[PDB]
């Protein structure tokens, strides 16, 4: 006689790029004034 594929999948992979860490810069103890509005460019990272 005859001799199903469950949808449950486990996907694990080590990242190749570090984290962006945007929360650390937004929650900084130094808040710039609206005249300053400091800028930080984020690139080549995972978020």
């Amino acid at each position: 006689l005859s001799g199903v594929k469950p949808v449950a999948t486990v996907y694990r992979r080590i990242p190749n790029l570090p984290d962006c860490d945007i929360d650390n810069w937004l929650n900084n103890v130094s808040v710039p004034s609206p005249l300053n509005w400091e800028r930080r460019i984020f690139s080549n990272c995972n978020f």
Partner: protein
């Protein structure tokens, strides 16, 4: 003038382990595209 009786032994093969193979688990494990492409060959797995 004087004799004795000696014994020997031998082995002759008679049987062999029975093997059963199917195409539903060797070529295409559980996929549908493989089964669709395997059926294109016709009755190639019905002779094995």
């Amino acid at each position: 003038t004087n004799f004795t009786i000696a014994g020997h032994e031998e082995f002759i093969q008679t049987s062999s382990p029975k093997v059963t193979i199917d195409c539903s688990a060797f070529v295409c494990s559980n996929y549908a595209a493989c089964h669709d492409l395997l059926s294109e060959y016709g009755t190639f797995c019905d002779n094995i």
